[PDB]
Amino acid sequence: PITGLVYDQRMMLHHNMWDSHHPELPQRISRIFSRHEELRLLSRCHRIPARLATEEELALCHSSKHISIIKSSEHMKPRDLNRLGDEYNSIFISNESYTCALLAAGSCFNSAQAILTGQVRNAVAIVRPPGHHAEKDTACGFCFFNTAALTARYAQSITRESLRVLIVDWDVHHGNGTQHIFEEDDSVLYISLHRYEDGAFFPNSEDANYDKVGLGKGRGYNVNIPWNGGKMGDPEYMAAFHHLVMPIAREFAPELVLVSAGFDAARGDPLGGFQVTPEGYAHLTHQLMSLAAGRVLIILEGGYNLTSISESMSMCTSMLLGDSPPSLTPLKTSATVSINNVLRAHAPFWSSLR
Ligand SMILES: O=C(NCCc1cc(C(=O)NO)no1)c1ccc(Cl)c(Cl)c1
Ligand SMILES: [K+]
Ligand SMILES: [K+]
Ligand SMILES: [Zn+2]
Numbered sequence: 001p002i003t004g005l006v007y008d009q010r011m012m013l014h015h016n017m018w019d020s021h022h023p024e025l026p027q028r029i030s031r032i033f034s035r036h037e038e039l040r041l042l043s044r045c046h047r048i049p050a051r052l053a054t055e056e057e058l059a060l061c062h063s064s065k066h067i068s069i070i071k072s073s074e075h076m077k078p079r080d081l082n083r084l085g086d087e088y089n090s091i092f093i094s095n096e097s098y099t100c101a102l103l104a105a106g107s108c109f110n111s112a113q114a115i116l117t118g119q120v121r122n123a124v125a126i127v128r129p130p131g132h133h134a135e136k137d138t139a140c141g142f143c144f145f146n147t148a149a150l151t152a153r154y155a156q157s158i159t160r161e162s163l164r165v166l167i168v169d170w171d172v173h174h175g176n177g178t179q180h181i182f183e184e185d186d187s188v189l190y191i192s193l194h195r196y197e198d199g200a201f202f203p204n205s206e207d208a209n210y211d212k213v214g215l216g217k218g219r220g221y222n223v224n225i226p227w228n229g230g231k232m233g234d235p236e237y238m239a240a241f242h243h244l245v246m247p248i249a250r251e252f253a254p255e256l257v258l259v260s261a262g263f264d265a266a267r268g269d270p271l272g273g274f275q276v277t278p279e280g281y282a283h284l285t286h287q288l289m290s291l292a293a294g295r296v297l298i299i300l301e302g303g304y305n306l307t308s309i310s311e312s313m314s315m316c317t318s319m320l321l322g323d324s325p326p327s328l329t330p331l332k333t334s335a336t337v338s339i340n341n342v343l344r345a346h347a348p349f350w351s352s353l354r
Contacts (some may be wrong), residue, residue: 003320004114004123005042006107007033008050011128013096017078022092023271023304024129024142032126032300035310041317048114048123053105053150060153061146061181063137070144074098088139089203101129101144108151108299115256115295116159122289122296122320126313130301132175132260133203140177141203148260148299149181152188155256162187166254168245168288169193170237170281171262171301172272173201174208174224178260184218189252191245193237193265195272196226210341213349220349223248225342229334233275234283236335237265238328241287243339247352249291257288257296263303263312271304278308278315279326285319296320 012026036042058067073084073093085093104127111123131147133140152165167182169175169192182188195201196208206212214222225240249257263281264272288296298316303309319325331339347353 001322002120003045003317004048004111004120005036005045005126005317006048006050006111006123007126008103008107010050011100011103013094014100014129015094015096016092017094018082018092027306028303028309029126029128029300031306031310032313035314036317039314039318041314041321044321045317046120048107048110050103051106051110052099052102053109053145057105057109057150057154058145060157061136061149066137070098070101070139090141091139097129097144104128104131105145105147105150108147108297109154111297112151112155112256113158115297116155121294124298124313124317124320125300127300130262131299132169132171132178132301133173135177135180141173142302143177146177146181148175148258149178151258151297151299156187164189164252164255166191166249166252166257166291167260168257169260169301170265170284171260172265172269172274173262173302174203175260176203176205176207179207179212179222179224182218183214183222184216186217186221189221189223189249189254191223191225191248193225193240194227195274197228210338210345213345220346223342223346225338227335227338229332231273231275232332232335233267234277234280235329235331237276237280237284239331239335240339241284244342244346246287248346248350251350251352254292255295257292259288259296259298260301261298261313261316262301263309266303266305266308266312268305268308269303271302278311279328281312282315282319282325283328285316286325289319
């Protein structure tokens, strides 16, 4: 009955040398860690060390060319870092970026190992840069390697290829990279909730819509819950978990749950524009703890209001440690529309939705 925590200040070294106020700040992770100390959560956790992912581990999801190219950035002069970053959608690179991406992934492997060997029951990983936009063959959206996707493949590599892994992506953005990596896989159920706005919200692709249900043997194993029509908050998130995430997850019966835990749907976030509260994130975490015999690993993705992400992620760790969930309207019409669209898309695959 132990919660793991991984945090390494070396992941602060990745930085934007042209714009020191870019929202994906080094301080995101140090602020979250500090808040865990302030609330006396850090001393209640088992500290798991960070390590570098190996290149062979990265090749679980990424092409050798992609790994090679990111690695080459370690000794580039500024002009070349600029040029390379600009080849992608929404990336900045420094000489430390590759190492930090390796540390984020390796931290999460050590956390998954700790859970699967029974050293801890659940864990939290305070890591940057984020992962979920990274594709097999490209970086995207502040992400270099797909930490969460790699962690699912790493878990399978130390257990069995068919280990059932649920990935719940509650970052306000679609994890396009995670959906693509697993699109034909029935061993990894990907469930994302995300602002969509009919394709106006980053990453601006209809890949994020509710009708993308998976392909081939993976059909039914990709669940997109897209929001349209502006701000959403605790009522909408709780309803999506009630009607969709939790019935489907129970039917899938995962053996490990990974949370792509961006905190950019939080109240106060300048990019997300949503209103999920710290108490809301606590309730979503407490629900997920009912799956997989409690085997849950929470992985930081996005989230840009330093106070919001620090309070929100700390509340999640408090839930993982077994604290009682804190005390928490009708849904926006368009949220009802979204949920019902997903129910219709997935009722052919999941009896629980019928
Ligand atoms: O590039 C930007 N936005 C698009 C890329 C992106 C990815 C994420 C994210 O949180 N993904 O889950 N979030 O954004 C960007 C950069 C600077 C500023 Cl100030 C803003 Cl508002 C956006
Ligand atoms: K998401
Ligand atoms: K899948
Ligand atoms: Zn995000």
